[PDB]
Symmetry: none
Subunit: 175 residues, 10 copies
């Protein structure tokens, strides 16, 4: 990897070091921290708002399903740490997300959304990306949607599992 590249499947993923909200406190999160696992990132338009984050509630509520089986879930938004933290902090009648079981990252300089070729430059928001990274820092799987349609946590899950297994074995189940 060099600085100046956009993420491209099969190639080294751009590294980060960023402030993050973990279980209600501030923590510094990097890609090197998780090297040795797979790391899943998913993007969303807007904090503290509608659009019905079906997929985010799915992943975060499904966080456990990722953890044991060998995957690491990460969220991201172009907000600052204070908005994300406040939006896990506050209750649901205040428009909160409630506490979640996965690490959340604040990219407030846009570096990540720029890195993976998601950011909408005019709107300062992100399309719906889903990217999967391996323990060597390579991006195995990417899905991207427009902002009217959601995710599938189970598709990503089994695909993760499969790529994991096939890496060590080098085979792939037939058909």
């Amino acid at each position: 990897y060099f600085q100046g590249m956009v993420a491209e499947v099969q190639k080294q993923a751009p590294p980060f070091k960023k402030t993050a909200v973990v279980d209600g406190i501030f923590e510094e999160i990097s890609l090197e921290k998780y090297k040795g696992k797979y790391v899943v990132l998913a993007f969303v338009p807007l904090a503290f708002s509608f659009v019905c984050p079906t997929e985010i509630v799915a992943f975060s509520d499904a966080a456990k399903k990722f953890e044991d089986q060998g995957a690491q879930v990460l969220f991201a938004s172009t907000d600052s740490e204070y908005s994300l933290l406040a939006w896990t902090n506050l209750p649901r009648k205040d428009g909160g997300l409630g506490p979640v079981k996965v690490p959340l990252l604040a990219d407030k300089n846009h570096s990540l959304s720029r890195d993976y070729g998601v950011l909408i430059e005019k709107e300062g928001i992100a399309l719906r990306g889903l990217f999967i990274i391996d323990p060597k820092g390579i991006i195995r799987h990417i899905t991207i949607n427009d902002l009217s349609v959601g995710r599938n946590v189970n598709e990503a899950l089994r695909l993760v599992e499969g790529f994991q297994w096939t890496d060590k074995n080098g085979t792939v189940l037939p058909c």
Copy 2:
């Protein structure tokens, strides 16, 4: 003019020789404006991994016709390679006569332009792209070569936009 197919933007036009029911016919992305399109790439003509996903992929046609969507496969393999790979039976690893167009990107323009081309290897990737009737790409999937994509994801995601784009209104939630 690197077009670089990207989500929520116009689809790059391409015109490529393709097989429609065992006969040579020119297929462009122009034909179906007004209809959805799912453009899916396969690694190799006569690949070595497994036949019987492929037999299941080639079988699904009516499912995108009911909800008003077109299926297309493309590869950097030649038009002829794809044809002959429909003409070989499945027992030998082939296909047989099938109902889906098989696009030939040998010239590398299409696959390059959508960013699924591996420039060193001159082979396609696991790509899948959804293009709406007005030309905007609403979805893309990419997997690493070794594991296949899923027809069910495409089928679901096309109808999500069927209903939501159809209404013209926000939805609860």
Copy 3:
């Protein structure tokens, strides 16, 4: 506005038409709107920031005075239109900014905090500023103050009163 520059005193203010939360609704707001009036532009901390009860309340209390004396204030920040809303809805007794009587002008794509050169792209945060802009669009009083300081409402209305006086009639006052 050349499609260039940054920000400079005198020469006409960079125009913008974006969005804002005015009194809890999203009114489409442009600086074009306020031609014929003075406009005072003020930048604020990130959502859910860390500040005392008095300072913040002050400028909401004087919010009405700009409406009175013949001028319009624009709160703005590199924050998001939705997050800010969340930070007015949440009442003060619970730690939220509470209701404010001025527009909160939302720049999440960094346009506003970019034209005026207050954004340090590393932090994604805007430094304090006061820009006096006449009905003609000319930037006259520049203030970069800095993160920690109160936006002085008596200096802001001193500016409104005095500048408006000197261009409205033309005689200064000595000394």
Copy 4:
């Protein structure tokens, strides 16, 4: 600082060395002279301006308040050291500035007002700029009142005195002073 950056807050202020009128005699002034002790650099538009001289007198009275806090006041304009020295040497009552307790600067070569962004290129004069410079030579505040309005010395004083708080505490105080 690299040779042609226009001054920007939080970054090393452009260093200068310039002819200056101090206490009726010529002296060279540069950033490096003042090291850690703060510096307040203020520009004045014109020597022998028709504007009220009072803006200046107050500054002298406030200089001592800047001194007790470990700060230093400075003045600058595109006028040459003869115009500025002539504008101090004439009594306050006769239309000049008379003697004052604060240094001046002769920018006759127009370097500073550029590098610091307070210059009007066509007029070859300075705006009302105010720069507050730190021990390590960092610009944490700038204010520009255009040309029709002078500055507020109690404002600037709270700003110096008040940034010493954030510096020496290492923290930001929403309500403190």
Copy 5:
């Protein structure tokens, strides 16, 4: 030779390394494997054409007639090595090319079709080329035939014979 060049007569042949089919097994045949020997480099464009490729069977059946003079036969095309392998396993009756004793190089990225300059960049295929490369790696020969017919078998022997006799004895 700088990289980026096109094949030129009396000059070093552009180096290449590819995957190639040998008797139904993958092998990396590169170029250097054959140093010290004439190297017959032939391109056959995309397969599956009505016209009869009977001439290639003359080479394949005569390849022991060739090899005795110290030559290595190679064909190539822009298909994938799995594609080539499929057209190699398909018998000749049903439109394939079943038997071969000669390596078939798959260059789909075009490095081989592009580097010796037999290419149509828009068609992603070559013309019908042949390059005879001496033991030093120099291109001694260039033939290019159009798409309608093909090349000629005895010509290659006549020329390779000629360059053997002339390169050995010095007399022309």
Copy 6:
């Protein structure tokens, strides 16, 4: 075709104008002249050389077969027109060649042999190039040999007859 390009199969033939020996006398020959017959444009290395005559006599003697099939035969070289004409005068026993029935184009400034890129520049000579041009100005065949072995008489004639059929039929 654009100027500066090199010829190739399927592409327009470069135009040129050159001094040439025709049945013993100078003439200005240009490619556009012969549009409407096939044209076999070949090159040969040097005047008063050794391998050349026995080869050249082959196509030269065939002039009636190529003019019967509606073709025109041309050789070219970087030697001077004078060297070709004198060559044509020198009789095969003592002579290099003997008089001949086919036009011969001498490019002494070297620009032509550049145009089709068969010229070996460092030596200022040309290989044995073989080009077949149709009435539309398209090259249907190319052969590039080295200097030690001649081409063939039968192959060009067989090829011209071969492409005629596909042109007119299918």
Copy 7:
């Protein structure tokens, strides 16, 4: 003449537009205003200085003599028009300039000196140049001296009246006479 060029004899003189001190009031002086007369353009380094430079006085009295001979004197400096104005309103005995009958131009933005090549960039003053510019706008004569020494006014008038004469006759004079 084009923007950015340096003043050179035999070429069109760069025009000028500047705020100037004319008889106690501000007036903007331009070159097109004098077309039909010669213009003697001069420069002085700094207002409110010592050593009572008398070159200026010489160009004032001699300005009377020019207008008698039909020429126009102009100074200039990059001192601001307030410094110059204050220094004209200032009586001479105090170190001031006293009253003056010639226009005095303010170069405050340095645009003119860069075009006649008399500007000192790092010191921000103008050399002592002397340019005689005719109705056609051409420079026939150049005198540049170091700032420390005054010009000879008598030579200025000598040659000025000189080139008006030679311009009328269209031929050189072997021996100057007065």
Copy 8:
């Protein structure tokens, strides 16, 4: 001094080395030769040129008045050294110059006039310039006369005797 700038006031005199006619012989004159003296460089229009006999003779005649304050005088032109030679031999009485006691700097490839900027590009002669240089190599005064006004022995010298003294004093000089 950098090659390509055309002299200036206060700036190093361009170095040059040019064959010169001195008292009927050829000698190499470089300005380095005169380091430690003042040097004066004047340009005469031509050789055998039509000019008043009295004006030309008087200027040449004074090398004593320059020597007495320790200064060297030099004339120059673009003609070849042989033409100027013939003009120093050819008696004044005949309409010529006559013998002359100061070197004659002739440059027929024009270098000198180019370095000092008096080269008239399309003529090939220089106007009447006279330059004063001190025992450093700095240019203290520059006069470019038009070709129709000769020099003034008193105006060329007066400034010289003045610079010797104003420099020598090393003290400020009262009004």
Copy 9:
């Protein structure tokens, strides 16, 4: 011909218009007036030269010799017309060449000297050049000796004497 070239045989020697010494006075000559005749331009090292007046008087002496064959003799040097004029008015005792019968041009500003490529930028002088311009404006001949040898006038227009007869004229 181009603007900025030097000079080349057959590329039409750069024209000019330049002040010339003619029979003792100044007269304006260009390479125009002589269209229709040949012109021989020749350069000499110096004016007032200390070297060899004899060859010089012998050079000037031939004028009618070029008029009879329809040719015009001009010389050129970097000495000014005021520097070069004085050199025809001086007797031998002072080193004078004498009054001469052929025009002598002063190229002081170097335009020509540089144009024809004989100039030495360092020395600021021209080597002895010779050019023959034909009525049609084409350079038919050029000779350039180094400075140590003059011109054989026989070598000067001998070539002209040949060109008259090559033209055939009838």
Copy 10:
């Protein structure tokens, strides 16, 4: 001569190396070969050209007169090596120049004709050149004639000796003496 200068008087003679027809066989000729002698280089357009080859015969039959003085004659043309061969194998009655006493250089890639700029570039031929070259490899004389007129040998010799004689004493000769 920096490799990409064109032949110019007093500058290093361009180095060149060529196959040549000398006395009925080939050979390699270089400028490097002769260092220590002068060299007189002449061009002629083409082989079996129907302008009279009297210019070539002149120097050739005179080759020894350009020798005893310690000089060497060189001919060059754009012809091939077998073109000059065929052109030396015709006796003069047939239009050829027969055997020759001087080296005949064959430049068929033009490097010599391009180096000295005597190429006619569109036609790939040569004008009639004559150049004088010193032992130190520097061109002190150049003559170009059109194709229509030859090059007098005697004049050329006259130009050959004097340069030698004056190089030896470093003294110029005012008035020439055979």
